[PDB]
C-alpha cells in the first residue's frame, strides 16, 4: 500500500500510532520484511491528491493482520445519534492530502510487507542455485543436475 512519509516508522513490532493502531498493526513476532520507497514522482500532481483513504477512528485496538471494511457509524461521544452523520458520530473514513510541494515527511511512500509463512508442508518458494563459473582443461568436480 501507500502511506505518508512521516508514518513509515510506526509500522514495526510494538510501535503504535495512527496507522499502526487502527489501520494495520504488525505483530510482535514477525519473520518477514518491511520495506518502503518514495513515489513522489509518479503518485503526485498539482491538483489536490485525495485518491488514498485511511481510517482514523476505530472502536478499539486493531488485531494484527485483520481486514475491517465495514462502514458503520463511529461513536466518539455518549450521544446515540443513531447513524445520522451528525455531531460526535462522524464517518470514520478520511483521505490523505499529497502535494508535490510538501516536505519529505509529507510525501507519499509506497510500502510493502512480505510476511514469510513457514509451514510443515513441503517447501515450495525458494531461491536460485549456486551456478558457479566453469573452468576448462583442469581436474575439477562437476555437479550437474544428475551427473556428479
Amino acid at each position: 500500500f501507500v502511506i505518508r512519509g512521516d508514518e513509515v516508522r510506526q509500522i514495526a513490532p510494538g510501535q503504535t500510532g495512527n496507522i499502526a493502531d487502527y489501520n494495520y498493526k504488525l505483530p510482535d513476532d514477525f519473520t518477514g520484511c518491511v520495506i518502503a520507497w518514495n513515489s513522489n514522482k509518479l503518485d503526485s500532481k498539482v491538483s489536490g491528491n485525495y485518491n488514498y483513504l485511511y481510517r482514523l477512528f476505530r472502536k478499539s485496538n486493531l488485531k494484527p493482520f485483520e481486514r475491517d471494511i465495514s462502514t458503520e457509524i463511529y461513536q466518539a461521544g455518549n450521544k446515540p445519534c443513531n447513524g445520522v452523520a451528525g455531531f460526535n458520530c462522524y464517518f470514520p473514513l478520511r483521505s490523505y492530502s499529497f502535494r508535490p510541494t510538501y516536505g519529505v515527511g509529507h510525501q507519499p511512500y509506497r510500502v510493502v510487507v512480505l510476511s514469510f509463512e513457514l509451514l510443515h508442508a513441503p517447501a515450495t518458494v525458494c531461491g536460485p542455485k549456486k551456478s558457479t563459473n566453469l573452468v576448462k582443461n583442469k581436474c575439477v568436480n562437476f555437479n550437474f543436475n544428475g551427473l556428479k
Epitope: 471494511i69 465495514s70 462502514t71 458503520e72 452523520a85 464517518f91
Partner: nanobody, 116 residues
Framework: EVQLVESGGGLVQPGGSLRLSCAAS????????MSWVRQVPGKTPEWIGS???????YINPSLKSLVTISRDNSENMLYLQMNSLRAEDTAMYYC????????????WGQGTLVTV
C-alpha cells in the same frame, strides 16, 4: 458475464447539471464496493466518490458540495449527480466496482466522455 455499461455523456453549458448512469448487470456486484473515477487526457486517474455496501458514501475533499451520489432505486443505479460543472470537468468518466485492490482485483468500465 459482468458487462456494466455507462451512459449520460454529452455537451452542456457550464451552468447546468448532468445525470450519469452506470447500468450494472444482474449479479452480486452491489454487495461489494462501488466507486467512480475520472480519466482526464494527459494525467493519471483521480478518485471522485465511493459508494459503500452499507448504504453510505464518501466524497473526495476536492469536489465537496459539488457532486452527490446515491442509488435510491434498489435495483441498479450509480447516479452520481454532478451539478454545477466547471471547465475542467470535460473528460472520460468511469465507474469501477472494486476501487480498493487496484491492479489486482479491479474491473474498469467503458467510460463516458462529457464535454462542458
Amino acid at each position: 458475464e459482468v458487462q456494466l455499461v455507462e451512459s449520460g455523456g454529452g455537451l452542456v453549458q457550464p451552468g447546468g447539471s448532468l445525470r450519469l448512469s452506470c447500468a450494472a448487470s444482474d449479479s452480486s456486484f452491489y454487495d461489494y464496493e462501488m466507486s467512480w473515477v475520472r480519466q482526464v487526457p494527459g494525467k493519471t486517474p483521480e478518485w471522485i466518490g465511493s459508494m459503500y455496501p452499507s448504504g453510505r458514501t464518501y466524497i473526495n475533499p476536492s469536489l465537496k458540495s459539488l457532486v452527490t451520489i446515491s442509488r435510491d432505486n434498489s435495483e441498479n443505479m450509480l447516479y452520481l449527480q454532478m451539478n454545477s460543472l466547471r471547465a475542467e470537468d470535460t473528460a472520460m468518466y468511469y465507474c469501477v466496482s472494486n476501487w480498493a485492490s487496484g491492479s489486482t482485483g479491479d474491473y474498469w468500465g467503458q467510460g463516458t466522455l462529457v464535454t462542458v
